Amino acid sequence: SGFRKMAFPSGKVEGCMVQVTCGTTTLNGLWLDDVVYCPRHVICTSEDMLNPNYEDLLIRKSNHNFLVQAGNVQLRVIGHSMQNCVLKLKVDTANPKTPKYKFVRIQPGQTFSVLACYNGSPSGVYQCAMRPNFTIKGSFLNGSCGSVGFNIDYDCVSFCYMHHMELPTGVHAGTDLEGNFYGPFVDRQTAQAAGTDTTITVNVLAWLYAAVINGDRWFLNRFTTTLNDFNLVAMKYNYEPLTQDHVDILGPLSAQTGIAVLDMCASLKELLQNGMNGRTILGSALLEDEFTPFDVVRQCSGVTF
Amino acid sequence: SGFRKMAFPSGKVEGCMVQVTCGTTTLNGLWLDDVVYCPRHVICTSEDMLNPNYEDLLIRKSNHNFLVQAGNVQLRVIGHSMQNCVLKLKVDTANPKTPKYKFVRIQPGQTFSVLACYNGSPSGVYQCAMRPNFTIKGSFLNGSCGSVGFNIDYDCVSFCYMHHMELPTGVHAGTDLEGNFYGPFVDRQTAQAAGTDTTITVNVLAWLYAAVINGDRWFLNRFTTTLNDFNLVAMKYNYEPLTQDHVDILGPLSAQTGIAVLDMCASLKELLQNGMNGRTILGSALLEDEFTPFDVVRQCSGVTF
Ligand SMILES: *CC(=O)Nc1cccc(N(C(=O)c2ccco2)[C@@H](C(=O)NCc2ccccc2)c2cccnc2)c1
Ligand SMILES: *CC(=O)Nc1cccc(N(C(=O)c2ccco2)[C@@H](C(=O)NCc2ccccc2)c2cccnc2)c1
C-alpha cells in the first residue's frame, strides 16, 4: 500500500549523460550509439540568445569546437549536424552503455521521469507531466540544459524530452529528441508566455482511483453524472475536457474498484464545487494530475523493469 | 528555478539488487562485496509470521536453502548469519558493481531515496522521510521487502533503510542495514500501532525558504516570534519542537534569502493558525515536511554525484 510520485530507475540513462562544451557554454548531452544529442544553443554566447541565427552561428563551428566529455575521458567528434533545435555530434566511439531505446513525442497529459544533470553528471530524478500548455513544471538550474525526460517499458528507454529553456514565469520548455519544441516555444531569450495551465482531468480521475485502492474513500459521493454535464463543470474550473477515449483508458481502474468512471466523475465534480474542506487525499490537499491511468496501474501492480 | 521532490539517481543501487528465495518466500536482497543482506522473515511461511521464533526457524535452514539470483545467474551461498532482523548471506562472488558505500542509522526527520524493487528488479524511485514516529510513508506492495533507502554524497552510497513490514494503517516499518528496526516495530504480524505522526518543523521551514528562493513569497508576514512562543504553537498543531540546533541548520538558507529564521517561524505560525486560504506554496496546498535544509541547499545549488 501507499502511493508516491514515482520516477523510473535512472541507471540506464545515467550511463548516457555527457558534458558538452562549445566556446563559453557547457551543458549536458545524451550519448546513444555514436551520436551525442544536445541543445543547439550550446553554440551561443549569452548575448547571442537575445536574437540568435543558429545556421549563421554554426558556420563558425567545426567538429573540434565541441568538447564532449564522458567522466574524465574526451570523445572524438567526427561530424556534426543541426536537426531542428538539437545538435547531433557524431563521435569516434559508440557508447558501450547504450540501452535499448526509442525517441517518442508525447501528448499533453503524459508523464515521464527527468534525470536532472549538471556538467554531464546526474544530480537527481523526479516525475513530470507535459502540461496542456506544453510547458513542464521542472526543477532546472543553469547548466541543466540537455537533461532528458524518459519512460522505461522493460529494458527499453523511450526518450521524450530534452530540456532547453526556462520561461520568465519559472516553468520550462524543451524539445523531443528530434529537436522539435513542445508547443510554440523557441530557443531565444524573448518574451514567451505560457498559456492557461489547465488540469489534466483524466489523470485526476486516475489518481482518485489510486486513492480508493489505497483506502482513501471519504470523497466517494452518492451521485453520478454524464460526460456532457461533467464537462460543463470542467470548463468552469479550467479542467481539460473529458473524452470517451479517456473513459476507455480508465476502464481497468473502474474494473479494479467497482466504481463506474462517471460515478468518479461526479465525485470529482463535488470536490471541485465544494473543495476538500481541509481534508487530504493520498497525502495531498490538491487534486493531483501528474499520474496517468497507466502510472496508477503500474505502481499499484508492481510493474518492474 | 522550480522545486520538485527529487530522489537520488538510482543506478549505483540498481546494480546491487538481487532476488532472494527461501522455501516459499521471495523478496529482495542487497548485494555488496560478497554479502547479500535481506529481511530475515524470508525464512517464514505466511503462518510463521503470526508468532515467529527466528532462531528456531533458522535451525532448519542451510546455505543451499537460500536461492540468490542476480538477473538470470545464481550466486553460490557459502555462509549465512542472522544479525538482528537481517540475514547476511555470504556468496562466492563479490558484486563487481559494488559502489563505495556505508551503513548509517538516520534520525527522525532525515530524508532518503527508496528504490522499490520486486523479484530483484528495480521498479521505481521516490523520496521519503523517517517520520517522528519512526514509520515511513512509502509505496510498497507484497514482494517489495528488502528494497532499500539511501542517500548519495558523491560516489558514496549511504544505505539507511531496508523495507520489512506494512502496518495495518498502510504505513511502513523497516530496519537499518545492521538489522535494527527504526522505532519499536517488530517483524511479526501482530497489532502494532504507529504513534502520533507529527510534522517535521525544521523541514517545513526549509521548504518555506525554498519557496522564497523560487519566487513564492505571499506567505511572508510582518511578524517575528521567539523559539518559546513558536513552540507553544507547534505543540498545538502536532509539530515537532524547534531547537537551537535546528535554527543553526537553517542558517545558510536564512543567509541566502535575508529572512531571519525566527521571522520565517512567525510566517509559519500564521500559516498554521489561519491556513492557506486556498492558495498554494511551490505547487502544494499543504505544508510540506520531507525536504531537509540540506535537501533544499542541494536542489537549489545543483549539487551533483
Ligand atoms: C538550461 C541551461 O543549462 N542554460 C544555460 C547554460 C549555460 C549558460 C546559460 N546562461 C547564463 O546566463 C548562465 C549564468 C550562469 C551560468 O549560465 C544563458 C543565458 O541566459 N543567456 C542569455 C541572457 C543571460 C542573462 C540576461 C539576459 C540574457 C546562456 C548562455 C550562453 C548560451 N546559452 C545560454 C544558460
Ligand atoms: C514486504 C514483502 O515483500 N512482504 C512479503 C513477501 C512475500 C510474501 C508475503 N506475504 C503474503 O501474504 C503474500 C501474498 C501474496 C504475496 O505475498 C506475507 C504475509 O503477510 N504473511 C502473513 C499473513 C498473510 C495473510 C494474513 C495473515 C498473515 C509473508 C509470507 C511469508 C513470509 N513473510 C511474509 C509478504
UniProtKB/Swiss-Prot annotation, chains A, B:
Highest taxon listed in the record's lineage: Viruses
Catalysed reaction equations from the record:
TSAVLQ-|-SGFRK-NH2 and SGVTFQ-|-GKFKK the two peptides corresponding to the two self-cleavage sites of the SARS 3C-like proteinase are the two most reactive peptide substrates. The enzyme exhibits a strong preference for substrates containing Gln at P1 position and Leu at P2 position
* Cross-linked sites for Glycyl lysine isopeptide (Lys-Gly) (interchain with G-Cter in ubiquitin): 5, 90
Impact noted for substituting residue 132 to H: In strain: Omicron/BA.1, Omicron/BA.2, Omicron/BA.2.12.1, Omicron/BA.2.75, Omicron/BA.4, Omicron/BA.5, Omicron/BQ.1.1, Omicron/XBB.1.5, Omicron/EG.5.1
Location of the active site: 41 (for 3cl-pro activity), 145 (nucleophile)
Activity regulation: the record says: Inhibited by pyridone-containing alpha-ketoamides compounds 13a and 13b. In turn, alpha-ketoamide 13b (tert-butyl (1-((S)-1-(((S)-4-(benzylamino)-3,4-dioxo-1-((S)-2-oxopyrrolidin-3-yl)butan-2-yl)amino)-3-cyclopropyl-1-oxopropan-2-yl)-2-oxo-1,2-dihydropyridin-3-yl)carbamate) inhibits SARS-CoV-2 replication in human lung cells. Inhibited ex vivo by michael acceptor inhibitor N3. Inhibited ex vivo by compound 11a and 11b.
User: Which segments sit on the Cytoplasmic face?
Assistant: 1-305
State the compartments where it is located.
Host cytoplasm; Host Golgi apparatus; Host nucleus
Q: Which residues form the Peptidase C30 domain?
A: 1-305
What does the record give as the function of this protein?
Cleaves the C-terminus of replicase polyprotein at 11 sites. Recognizes substrates containing the core sequence [ILMVF]-Q-|-[SGACN]. Cleaves and inactivates human TRMT1, preventing tRNA guanine(26)-dimethylation of tRNAs. May cleave human NLRP1 in lung epithelial cells, thereby activating the NLRP1 inflammasome pathway. May cleave human GSDMD, triggering alternative GSDME-mediated epithelial cell death upon activation of the NLRP1 inflammasome, which may enhance the release interleukins 1B, 6, 16 and 18. Also able to bind an ADP-ribose-1''-phosphate (ADRP).
Q: How does it assemble?
A: 3CL-PRO exists as monomer and homodimer. Only the homodimer shows catalytic activity. Interacts with host FBXO22; this interaction promotes the proteasomal degradation of nsp5.
The protein's name: 3C-like proteinase nsp5
